[PDB]
Amino acid sequence: KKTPPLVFYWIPWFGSAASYGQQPYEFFESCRQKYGDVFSFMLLGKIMTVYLGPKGHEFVFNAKLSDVSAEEAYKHLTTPVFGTGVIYDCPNSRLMEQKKFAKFALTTDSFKRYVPKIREEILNYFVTDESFKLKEKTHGVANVMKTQPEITIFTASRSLFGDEMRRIFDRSFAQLYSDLDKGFTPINFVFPNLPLPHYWRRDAAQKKISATYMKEIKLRRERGDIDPNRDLIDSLLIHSTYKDGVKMTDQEIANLLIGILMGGQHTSASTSAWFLLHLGEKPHLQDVIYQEVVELLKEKGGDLNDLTYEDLQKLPSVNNTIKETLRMHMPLHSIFRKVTNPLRIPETNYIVPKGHYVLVSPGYAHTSERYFDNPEDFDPTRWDTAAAKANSVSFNSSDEVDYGFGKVSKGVSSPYLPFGGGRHRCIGEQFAYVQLGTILTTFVYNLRWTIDGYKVPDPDYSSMVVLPTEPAEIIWEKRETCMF
Ligand SMILES: CC[C@@H]([C@H](C)O)n1ncn(-c2ccc(N3CCN(c4ccc(OC[C@@H]5CO[C@@](Cn6cncn6)(c6ccc(F)cc6F)C5)cc4)CC3)cc2)c1=O
Ligand code: HEM
């Protein structure tokens, strides 16, 4: 009566890892139907306490700074991958402000600039890459698991870092990111640093990529032109001063960029991968977006005026599509807080011993039939003339709160929380809809793809983000054959 019911573990230290590791939303539901909303289950030595539904969103995201802590849970996943000093390798208050700094490059004025850039890179890929080669080919097959992470990393790189850094990638140093990218695996949670080639190439890579950003930060500064609020590198050059007057070192700034680049790239890659495969099973939907985009362009020329950020606003169908994939495949299937003081689940007789791991999964409610009718059908129409990414789209108090990076909703009690809530809330929400929006609109305008006498592959949950199975590929044709 004082603790949540810990459950059976197939092999004990191993715990429920396979059932949960194989499918969390299924595993969660099986327990719910005979224990209720909260229950514990052990995993890799660490036992896991879960709270399902909106109320579990409140108890976790809105937990006091003293009761839980995300630094503890994420430290080894990120630090060895990004670097020291920043993001979970520092007090919470340092993290909060590092958000404030970064947000200055994620504003409406930046976004208007980012869209043409982001589109321009996509068009580079359509031509130069073997997957498409639109200039010479009219048919094609694209492995979305290859293309999307490359398109996402090139688009993010160009928007947030600039054109000098995007030209540096055209080289072998591209490799260094593949090596650091491999370092970013849930295998870190338990194995942070081992002596085999993987971990060495990963530490080496980090230090060389950190140097690359340090040198560009250096020159961009001394050269003396950091004036346009061009990007994320500019905004950290001018804002990197904490409350107390302490100032981030340039290596620390460099590690933050790496953190944010890889952080944003993985999540956004999944979602673009997923709405390509899903849009491919239902090509009817692609033509909905295509008609809407052409009607917006108006009378002649494929586009009367190349599509802008403001225009991206006027396209509910594009935005509704992004909301549906984030519902059906929230890249982050489970979010953790390590418990630092015993917690008294209210409207309950439970204490969560200190030292347990607290797991919240908005994705469950997203996939849940208890909260969405026909939850496993890809139907973006369910968003009824409501294309907003977020608002207090659910109940309880939704008044505002400031944790040090801008005022944010107090109430997190919604079934749909793809970007989370509370202090660790995502700051990249609007950058994603822009980036993904531009990828989507650029894709349908030039290509019409399909899905090979089949339907969407089963998701793999064994990595950072929820990704598709190995033979994941779309077969494209051209909506207009002659353009160069
Ligand atoms: C079946 C055999 C079995 C045995 C074991 O072999 N087995 N096999 C396989 N598995 C297996 C494999 C994996 C798991 N994982 C459980 C834990 N999951 C996970 C996912 C995401 C996480 O997020 C980390 C942070 C959160 O915020 C981010 C992200 N972000 C938000 N916006 C942008 N980025 C962030 C923030 C800000 C930044 F600036 C940067 C950032 F990055 C980073 C944390 C944890 C992964 C799956 C479980 C089981 C097994 O159990
Ligand atoms: C669809 C794409 C994205 C999704 C679904 C997403 C989702 C989330 C979620 C759920 C969290 C909360 C994690 C937690 O509570 O522990 C989060 C945090 C965060 N995200 Fe994102 N994110 C996305 C893209 C981005 C991008 C593009 C950036 C940067 C440009 C970004 C930066 C962050 C940061 C800095 C945090 C805060 C980490 C913390 O407070 O501990 N995310 N994101």
Mark out the alpha helices in 282-425 (DSSP H runs): 283-297, 309-313, 316-328, 362-367
Q: Which numbered ligand comes closest to the C-alpha of 152?
A: 2
> What spacing in Å lies between the alpha carbon of 270 and ligand 2's midpoint?
13
Range of the domain at 146: 16-478
Number of H-type helices and E-type strands within the chain: 17, 14
Inside any domain, residue 5: no
Q: Whose CA is nearest to atom 40 of ligand 2?
A: 424
CA dist 324 and 271 (Å) reads 10
Q: Which numbered ligand comes closest to the C-alpha of 75?
A: 1
CA dist 217 and 226 (Å) reads 10
Query: Does the Cβ of 260 fall within 6 Å of ligand 1?
Result: yes
Inside any domain, residue 400: yes
How many domains, the chain? 1
Query: Does the Cβ of 82 fall within 6 Å of ligand 1?
Result: no
Inside any domain, residue 7: no
Helix (H, G, I), strand (E, B) or coil at 375: coil
Q: Which numbered ligand comes closest to the C-alpha of 405?
A: 2
Inside any domain, residue 10: no
CA dist 389 and 425 (Å) reads 14
Torsion of CA 250, 434, 205, 193, to 10 degrees: 100
Inside any domain, residue 184: yes
For residue 227 the two structure tokens come to 């004036």
Contacts of residue 253, Cβ cutoff 8 Å, sequence gap at least 6 = 213, 217, 236, 237, 240
- For the chain, how far is it from start to end, CA to CA, in angstroms? 69
CA dist 80 and 16 (Å) reads 27
Query: Does the Cβ of 426 fall within 6 Å of ligand 1?
Result: yes
Inside any domain, residue 357: yes
Q: Is 90 annotated as a binding residue?
A: no
> What spacing in Å lies between the alpha carbon of 294 and ligand 2's midpoint?
32
Which one-letter DSSP state was computed for residue 248?
-
Contact 164, 216 (CB under 8 A): yes
CA dist 44 and 47 (Å) reads 8
Query: Does the Cβ of 462 fall within 6 Å of ligand 1?
Result: yes
Query: Does the Cβ of 322 fall within 6 Å of ligand 1?
Result: no
> What spacing in Å lies between the alpha carbon of 115 and ligand 1's midpoint?
29
Inside any domain, residue 451: yes
For residue 325 the two structure tokens come to 């994939």
Tell me how far CA of residue 130 lies from CA of 121, 208, 470, in angstroms.
15, 28, 19
> What spacing in Å lies between the alpha carbon of 352 and ligand 1's midpoint?
22
> What spacing in Å lies between the alpha carbon of 454 and ligand 2's midpoint?
32
CA dist 45 and 42 (Å) reads 7
Helix (H, G, I), strand (E, B) or coil at 219: helix
Q: What is the CATH number of the domain that holds 298?
A: 1.10.630.10
Inside any domain, residue 1: no
Contact 9, 42 (CB under 8 A): yes
